[PDB]
């Protein structure tokens, strides 16, 4: 994918945002911004330019499922890639996110290889 693709990395824990940003950097993606919850995320998204969202689920203010649903329903960003990265591992969590339009889903804790694999699966699905 285009190494200038702009990522938004959303999680309420700075440690996990830092993991994901550093992993993206290794993969060659440096156009990366962070958000602390779904509301913060939507403010950045409204500012424009983003081409990929990686998001946690459990967050205050607006959780990641609500964030995914909002993005998918919004005519300006309905096809935005959204990779869910969450500790939630139950099949019913995975179903809810998948049905809501998740582009992919990674369970925490995850390896560097898993993130790269699941990112590439999305790129290839979307022809990026
Ligand atoms: F808080 Be996340 F869903 F890991
Ligand atoms: Mn969280």
From Swiss-Prot:
Changing residue 86 to I: Impairs chemotaxis. GO terms for molecular function: acetyltransferase activity; magnesium ion binding; phosphorelay response regulator activity. Keywords: Acetylation, Chemotaxis, Cytoplasm, Flagellar rotation, Magnesium, Metal-binding, Phosphoprotein, Two-component regulatory system. One of its GO terms (cellular component) is cytoplasm. The modification 4-aspartylphosphate is found at residue 56. InterPro entries: CheY-like_superfamily (IPR011006), Sig_transdc_resp-reg_receiver (IPR001789), ST_Response_Regulator (IPR052048). Residues 6-123 form the Response regulatory domain. Its main location: cytoplasm. The keyword Phosphoprotein applies. Mg(2+) binds at residues 11-12, 56, 58. The modification N6-acetyllysine is found at residues 91, 108. Involved in the transmission of sensory signals from the chemoreceptors to the flagellar motors. In its active (phosphorylated or acetylated) form, CheY exhibits enhanced binding to a switch component, FliM, at the flagellar motor which induces a change from counterclockwise to clockwise flagellar rotation. Overexpression of CheY in association with MotA and MotB improves motility of a ycgR disruption, suggesting there is an interaction (direct or indirect) between the c-di-GMP-binding flagellar brake protein and the flagellar stator. Interacts (phosphorylated CheY) with CheZ (via C-terminus). This is Chemotaxis protein CheY. It comes from Escherichia coli (strain K12). The gene is cheY.
């Amino acid at each position: 994918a285009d190494k200038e693709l702009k990522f938004l990395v959303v999680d309420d824990e700075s440690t996990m945002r830092r993991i994901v940003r550093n992993l993206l950097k290794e993969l060659g993606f440096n156009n990366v911004e962070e958000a602390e919850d779904g509301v913060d995320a939507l403010n950045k998204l409204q500012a424009g330019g983003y081409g990929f969202v990686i998001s946690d689920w459990m967050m205050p203010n607006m959780d990641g499922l609500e964030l995914l649903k909002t993005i998918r329903a919004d005519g300006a960003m309905s096809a935005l890639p959204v990779l869910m990265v969450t500790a939630l591992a139950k099949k019913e969590n995975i179903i809810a996110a998948a049905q809501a339009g998740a582009s992919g889903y990674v369970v925490k804790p995850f390896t560097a290889a898993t993130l790269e694999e699941k990112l590439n699966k999305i790129f290839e699905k979307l022809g990026m």
